[PDB]
Design a protein around this ligand. Structure first.
Ligand SMILES: CCOP(O)(=S)OCC
Ligand SMILES: [Co+2]
Ligand SMILES: [Fe+2]
Length: 328
């Protein structure tokens, strides 16, 4: 009965299946893929790489990913549609703004930002008619004044449409608490909200505090680790020094504390990556050759071997996303 918008059109919520809720086809910038496709080798190479990756994830049991690339992550919805078709993996596109908005966005009011997010949800992205099924926002510490607007506009667009809101945080600085306060001041239900990059900290007081309030807790950087790369400053800074097993243990920690229905798991992976150092993609592909299959291939069995019941693992990877993505 319930429907979610994908880049290939509407699908029944029940067909979303095993869903990775924070992923990217390509992490880039507005206009960039159009202006400088050679940065990625070519558009064709980038698409082929993405299709091979999503097919690998599909073979591992992934049926849907949520591509949380916003306008300013250089989201290219035609690219998403082409790769979703070729790999036969659903992709839900995002609206919202991440932490690289250009001046034409930064100068906008909360009202004007709301109109923009609503356009992408209700009318379509660009001239494509492809509708966004989630709203992505971001802080990196205390919200800037503009980021406050963005979080408010995201709350208002969500209330209007029922589409959920997902966040980038600096987890170590406990951004979720301020994001939560702002969302609740707009009257948004915490069940419509996922506080992302929450596996970047082992602070369970912070994480259980959010979960107790009804937030979804996004443990979405599973394969990120610079262990063994500590001499590569840019890898260290982005990936951290905690192992994937350390990250995965948080899933179990939250389940053991009664919060199984409040967890979303993902990789934050990508197949192209121009908003960071050059050749960062090669470093990542060495760290995690399995790409977006890493969760089903490594994380889920690790949890199973620690005694997490299959029904609980299914609730986390299928029922939680379905509940989150269903417009409510
Ligand atoms: C390493 C990827 O980090 P993000 O979720 S902030 O996306 C970057 C495009
Ligand atoms: Co992020
Ligand atoms: Fe991301």
């Amino acid at each position: 009965g319930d429907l979610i918008n994908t880049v290939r059109g509407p699908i029944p919520v029940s067909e979303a299946g095993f869903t990775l809720t924070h992923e990217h086809i390509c992490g880039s910038s507005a206009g960039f893929l159009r202006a400088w496709p050679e940065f990625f080798g070519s558009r064709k190479a980038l698409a082929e790489k993405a299709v091979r990756g999503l097919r690998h994830a599909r073979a591992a049991g992934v049926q849907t990913i949520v591509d949380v690339s916003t306008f300013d992550i250089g989201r290219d919805v035609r690219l998403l549609a082409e790769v979703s078709r070729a790999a036969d993996v659903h992709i839900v596109a995002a609206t919202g703004l991440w932490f690289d908005p250009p001046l034409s966005m930064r100068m906008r009011s909360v009202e004007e930002l709301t109109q923009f997010f609503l356009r992408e949800i209700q009318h379509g992205i660009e001239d494509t008619g492809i509708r966004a099924g989630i709203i992505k926002v971001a802080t990196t510490g205390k919200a800037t004044p503009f980021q406050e607007l963005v979080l408010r506009a995201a709350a208002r667009a969500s209330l209007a449409t029922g589409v959920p809101v997902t966040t980038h945080t600096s987890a170590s600085q406990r951004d979720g608490e301020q994001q939560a306060a702002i969302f609740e001041s707009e009257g948004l239900s915490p069940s419509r909200v996922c506080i992302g990059h929450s596996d970047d900290t082992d602070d369970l007081s912070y994480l259980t505090g959010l979960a107790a309030r009804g937030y979804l807790v996004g443990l979405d950087r599973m394969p990120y680790s610079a262990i063994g790369l500590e001499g590569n400053a840019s890898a260290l800074a982005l990936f951290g020094t905690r192992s994937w097993q350390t990250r995965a243990l948080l899933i179990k920690a939250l389940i053991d504390r009664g919060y199984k229905d409040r967890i979303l798991v993902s990789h934050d992976w990508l197949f192209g990556f121009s908003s960071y150092v050059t050749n960062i993609m090669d470093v990542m592909d060495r760290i995690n050759p399995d790409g977006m299959a890493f969760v089903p291939l490594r994380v889920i069995p690790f949890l199973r071997e620690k005694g997490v019941p299959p029904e609980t693992l299914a609730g986390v990877t299928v029922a939680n996303p379905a509940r989150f993505l269903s417009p409510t």
